[PDB]
Amino acid sequence: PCRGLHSIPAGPVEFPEIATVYVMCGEKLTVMIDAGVSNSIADFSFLDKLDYIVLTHLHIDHIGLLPELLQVYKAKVLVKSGFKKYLTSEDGLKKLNESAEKVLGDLYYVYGGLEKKLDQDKVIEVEGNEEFDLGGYRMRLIYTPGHARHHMSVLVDDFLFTGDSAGAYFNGVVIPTTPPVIDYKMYMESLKRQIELKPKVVGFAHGGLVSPKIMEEHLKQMLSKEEIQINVDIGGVAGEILRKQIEVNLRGLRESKKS
Ligand SMILES: [Zn+2]
Numbered sequence: 001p002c003r004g005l006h007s008i009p010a011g012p013v014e015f016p017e018i019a020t021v022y023v024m025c026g027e028k029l030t031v032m033i034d035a036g037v038s039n040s041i042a043d044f045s046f047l048d049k050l051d052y053i054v055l056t057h058l059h060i061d062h063i064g065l066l067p068e069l070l071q072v073y074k075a076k077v078l079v080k081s082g083f084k085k086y087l088t089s090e091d092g093l094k095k096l097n098e099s100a101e102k103v104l105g106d107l108y109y110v111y112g113g114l115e116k117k118l119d120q121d122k123v124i125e126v127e128g129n130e131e132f133d134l135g136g137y138r139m140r141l142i143y144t145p146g147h148a149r150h151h152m153s154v155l156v157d158d159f160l161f162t163g164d165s166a167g168a169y170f171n172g173v174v175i176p177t178t179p180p181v182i183d184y185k186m187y188m189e190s191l192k193r194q195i196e197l198k199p200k201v202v203g204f205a206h207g208g209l210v211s212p213k214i215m216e217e218h219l220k221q222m223l224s225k226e227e228i229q230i231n232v233d234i235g236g237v238a239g240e241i242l243r244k245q246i247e248v249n250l251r252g253l254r255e256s257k258k259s
């Protein structure tokens with residue numbers, strides 16, 4: 001059977017590592033954190049069963065493979081309460097894709113929009129403080145708004161999976177996870193709260209596993225009086241995709257400070 005922790009690249013074929021999906025295989029429950037971009041060819045066939053898929057948030061790059069995953073596995077999706085309708089109705093999906101396209105531009109087509117709504121009985125709303133016994137490991141959800149009103153983080157023992165609430169990290173460079181539009185005050189509060197949890201390792205949705213110290217570097221980055229300007233040493237299409245995303249995030253950061 002499946003055991004241990006699996007960190008799987010779930011980005012588009014042009015940049016598989018831009019997004020990471022985590023799977024924690026406990027003795028009693030198997031849980032997945034996030035679900036990749038719609039256009040990802042990530043293969044999760046190494047799983048015999050899947051009990052829960054926790055969505056850190058509802059941005060399109062974290063919920064892409066749900067349609068297929070919910071047909072192959074008997075998994076239930078856990079989402080912040082009040083947002084289930086965005087996944088279970090045509091009008092809900094239309095709004096998710098609408099906001100995604102407006103914010104992402106060309107990246108919308110790279111990652112891929114949502115095309116199929118999910119069955120309501122497969123989606124469970126949670127408050128963001130629920131605890132689960134995975135069997136040999138303990139999981140606890142944590143509501144972490146700021147990046148989005150529907151953002152939640154996940155703590156498995158001393159591993160903290162932060163989604164897009166505590167930064168991104170590529171090639172040794174800290175990138176702000178601040179696309180339009182973030183709630184600056186809430187974002188800062190959630191970031192401080194997570195730093196205070198003192199996890200041993202952090203799992204970024206964008207950048208994979210990183211040291212907890214990176215969260216503190218991101219906090220400092222958020223407090224800079226000078227305009228944040230980032231440059232990442234990466235080439236090819238992957239480099240261009242990342243640069244576009246960075247521009248979106250820097251725009252969001254600039255605008256959040258004016259609020
Ligand atoms: Zn996001």
Ligand SMILES: [Zn+2]
Binds near residue numbers: 059061062205206
């Ligand atoms: Zn994201």
